[PDB]
Write a protein that binds this ligand. Structure first.
Ligand SMILES: CC(C)=CCC/C(C)=C/CC/C(C)=C/CSP(=O)(O)OP(=O)(O)O
Ligand SMILES: [Mg+2]
Ligand SMILES: [Mg+2]
Length: 499
């Protein structure tokens, strides 16, 4: 059947990767495996290969290579795994003063590799800032008169690099483009085609159960004003992590992201502040007895929240790890502590200071709750230390919420401001000094780049936790970039399979 064919292809690819252990073919094969959405099948072998590459790196046993593609791909592959390889290997190509050599203008492959490698630099990284402008200029110059199978890659990359691109949609696009390339591998492409079909089948199957749970719930029939966002809540928990072993982790969190959104609306689109200051204490206490005095719709919403939380506790109690949900309840404690502040600013007719507003909005984005609540379905990574680290609000969690808040704000500050809503970041920054809407938008756009550069730094080897746990903030930051660029996502990532 398909599974035996997939296993045979997996062993074939393992044998080839072993046989190319010393050449650039290893780098190309690892890159193609990662970009085809099958990188998780070869975690151990890829880790060993990258360890060997790092050991023979740093000019200790490294042969000088003039190929921009080879060194750029090596740097990008090593930086994606954690190794702190210095961004100084690009000094060789900066021969003509501080500008890159002109002989690379016509090298579209090396230019694109440098383009994708440059975005992975950190704040302290050098030689990875003017490269973006260089490659942008030359790729735009050479785009109109370029051949189709590589102009497709150029057009796919100019919109967003691999750093800011969700992995599943980019994997689909690369599988679609890789057919036209004449230097491809047939077995790797077939393996990716089979794996994509199986993972898409699993992803489509889970949505059926989630929709069944929503239908059986009391949420949709009553409380009419809630806007149904079940699909756009699964796709946000589909690009965070899509591996099959995390399937149990995608049911439990998506069920609790519709509840955390319904709550946002309950606090801003409507409701009076007197009535909202009694919801916060009810959430903090976390008992059904606190629901007696609440209004009907808040009572129903928080009762459903309590029911789903206790149901999830019952499920994690089989393996003796129910106490993890003793950390989720605390997280929901802070979120309502942030929603209840902004509403007050709505009623007091006050414009918060930018720093205070940003500090409050980092918790009112629910990216801090979504980083704690994603550990529910992790088998061995979910430990007490991991949950304590996640609750302690590390810098990695903070820098993935900056992008959310600041991008949303810029996009959705016109629909709500007409009605009674909390002042957004652009209005807060226009409050001090004197700036226009566009000049404040550019200021708020100059912060997303620094947030991305700060998020790139946290995923290195000086890490308190594992790589699987730290990968989540990066994917959370990538999902706001896909939205603010969606029936195409549903129709050709979940409905239309790959031939
Ligand atoms: C599918 C989707 C968009 C969200 C589900 C997951 C969440 C909660 C993501 C982060 C928060 C965002 C971007 C809310 C947009 S609605 P808003 O701008 O009205 O929220 P606000 O009141 O401004 O915080
Ligand atoms: Mg709102
Ligand atoms: Mg807003």
């Amino acid at each position: 059947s398909t599974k035996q064919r997939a296993e045979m292809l997996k062993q074939e690819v393992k044998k080839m990767l072993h046989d190319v252990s010393g050449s650039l073919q290893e780098l190309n094969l690892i890159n193609e495996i990662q970009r085809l959405g099958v990188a998780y099948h070869f975690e151990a072998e890829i880790s060993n290969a990258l360890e060997r590459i790092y050991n023979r790196e740093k000019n200790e046993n490294g042969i000088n290579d003039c190929d921009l593609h080879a060194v750029a791909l090596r740097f990008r592959l090593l930086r994606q795994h954690g190794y702190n390889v210095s961004s100084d290997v690009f000094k060789k190509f900066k021969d003509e003063n501080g500008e890159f050599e002109a002989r690379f203008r016509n090298d579209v492959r090396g230019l694109l590799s440098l383009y994708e490698a440059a975005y992975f630099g950190t704040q302290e990284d050098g030689h990875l800032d003017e490269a973006i402008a260089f490659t942008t200029k030359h790729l735009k110059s050479l785009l109109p008169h370029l051949s189709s199978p590589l102009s497709d890659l150029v057009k796919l990359a100019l919109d967003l690099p691999l750093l800011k691109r969700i992995e599943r949609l980019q994997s689909k696009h690369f599988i679609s483009i890789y057919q036209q390339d004449e230097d491809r591998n047939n077995v790797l492409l077939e393996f990716a085609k089979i794996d994509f079909n199986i993972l898409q089948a699993l992803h489509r199957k889970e949505l059926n159960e989630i929709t069944r749970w929503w239908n059986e719930s009391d949420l949709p029939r009553k409380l009419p004003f809630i806007r149904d966002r079940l699909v756009e809540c699964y796709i946000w928990m589909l690009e965070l992590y899509y591996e099959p072993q995390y399937s149990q982790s995608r049911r439990m969190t998506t069920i609790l992201l519709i509840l955390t959104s319904s709550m946002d609306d309950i606090y801003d689109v409507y409701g009076k502040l007197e009535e909202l200051e009694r919801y916060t204490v009810a959430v903090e206490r976390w008992e059904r007895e606190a629901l007696d005095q609440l209004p009907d719709y808040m009572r129903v919403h928080l009762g459903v929240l309590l029911t789903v939380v206790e149901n999830f506790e019952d499920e994690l109690g089989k393996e003796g790890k129910s106490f993890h949900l003793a950390y989720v309840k605390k997280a929901f404690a802070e979120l309502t502590k942030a929603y209840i502040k902004e509403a007050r600013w709505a009623n007091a007719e006050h414009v918060p200071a930018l720093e205070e507003y940003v500090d409050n909005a980092v918790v009112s984005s629910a990216y801090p709750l979504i980083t704690t609540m994603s550990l529910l379905g992790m088998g061995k990574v979910a430990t007490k230390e991991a949950f304590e680290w996640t609750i302690s609000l590390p810098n990695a969690v903070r820098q993935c919420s900056m992008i959310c808040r600041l991008v949303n704000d810029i996009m959705s500050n016109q629909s709500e401001q007409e009605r009674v809503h909390v002042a957004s970041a652009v209005q807060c920054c226009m409050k001090e000094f004197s700036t226009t809407y566009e000049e404040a938008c550019k200021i708020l756009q100059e912060k997303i780049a620094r947030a991305w550069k700060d998020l790139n730094k946290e995923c290195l080897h000086p890490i308190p936790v594992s790589l699987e746990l730290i990968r989540r903030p990066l994917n959370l930051a990538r999902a706001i970039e896909f939205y603010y660029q969606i029936k195409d996502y549903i129709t050709m990532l979940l409905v239309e399979p790959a031939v």
